[PDB]
Design a protein around this ligand. Structure first.
Ligand code: GSH
Ligand code: GSH
Ligand code: HPX
Ligand code: HPX
Lengths: 200, 200
């Protein structure tokens, strides 16, 4: 099993998930520019859209999109309880949060990283983010994790996205529950092992 | 079961899925400007983020995010095969496609429907879409649907987002396989019933 990744990128979410699952896998780094792997192979042969993550199975079969990948990972080690059982209502609730993180958080961070983007663009996105962060913050007043008392792959994804705040000049202090969350997920061994393996 | 919708918005996706599934439900229109439902209820009481779709279950529980909703819907009628079975590889592959449509397609249409979006934002997004729609056109070149020969809720979601192109002046002429896909899906009785039901 292979995870195509780039240090600090959103591929850190499946990376943390794999560790939390206690699975073994190979990291393959990708040059996000020439779209070539560390071993000099063409990545657009693996993922046509040219982004990370991509999970490749022993099979040769592949999966892209974080929310899909992290669900595949969790379902390999149900004992770890990293996602609700499929067919339970809480699994749809997991998927809801995964899509929220991806479409409402992650995609809003994207143009803040972009040097080309105007200041009128960035400021509109920053206002939307503040609002969406407020919503996530309120959720994390109810319980230490997005779905309650057990860590799920949705918390892992959220931890990764929130960790980008430092690079786009977002202070998380206005939301005590988001800082409490960061701290709580930040100090897990699997998470640390993942940051270490990525040089962070 | 209630579906909160706005005519022609992304909620048309669960709408079509519900009809494909043959399920009983009540459409509840939402004024996206004033954020009031048809009954005059404050819609933020229902979805804290303020957007459609939202699925309200018989028992009062709610689900947001298109990709979560359409999976719940499909899982209600497994005989109809609107999604591959949970735990199968092809179900992760559906979630990949659903997250792709949401984060890579839908979210890039969003600024185009905005008057207050700068022409810089719009030009960038149109370019992202040109590339991303190319990837989907290639996917739909030698197979009728996203997952192969079987229509799924991913195809329904794609069909709805593609339908937005006329309203924001996106020409799909460079992608004949996408127009072919539109005619393949748009010709289904549940799709045409939903269009009619939304007053379109
Ligand atoms: N929709 C994709 C987005 C993946 C994505 O935005 N990956 C970024 C890193 S966080 C990337 O590889 N860079 C963008 C690119 O070069 O295309 C997903 O959720 O997996
Ligand atoms: N992340 C949400 C996005 C939903 C969404 O962007 N809905 C739009 C219509 S397509 C909407 O209700 N408009 C936003 C608003 O009215 O403020 C999802 O995938 O369901
Ligand atoms: O969301 C995007 O468009 C995107 O490419 C995000 C990438 C983020 C990073 O690679 C990254 C690396 C180190 C630290 C923070 C962020
Ligand atoms: O993508 C969005 O965030 C968004 O607000 C999409 C809106 C879709 C529509 O309401 C719509 C309605 C009729 C025709 C085309 C589009």
């Amino acid at each position: 099993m292979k995870l195509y990744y780039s240090p600090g990128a959103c591929s850190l979410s499946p990376h943390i998930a794999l560790r939390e699952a206690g699975l073994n896998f190979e990291l393959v780094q990708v040059d996000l520019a020439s779209k070539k792997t560390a071993s000099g192979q063409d990545y657009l042969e693996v993922n046509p859209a040219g982004y990370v993550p991509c999970l490749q199975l022993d099979d040769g079969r592949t999966l892209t999109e974080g929310p899909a990948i992290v669900q595949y990972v969790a379902d390999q080690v149900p004992g770890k309880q990293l996602a609700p059982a499929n067919g339970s209502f809480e699994r749809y609730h997991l998927q809801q949060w995964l899509n929220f993180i991806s479409s409402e958080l992650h995609k809003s961070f994207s143009p803040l990283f972009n040097p080309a983007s105007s200041d009128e663009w960035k400021n509109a996105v920053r206002q939307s983010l503040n609002t969406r962060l407020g919503q996530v913050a309120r959720q994390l007043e109810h319980a230490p994790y997005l779905l309650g008392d057990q860590l799920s792959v949705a918390d892992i994804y959220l931890f990764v996205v929130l960790g980008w705040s430092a690079y786009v000049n977002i202070d998380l202090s206005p939301w005590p529950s988001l800082q409490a969350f960061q701290g709580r997920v930040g100090g897990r061994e699997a998470v640390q092992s993942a940051l270490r393996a990525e040089g962070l």
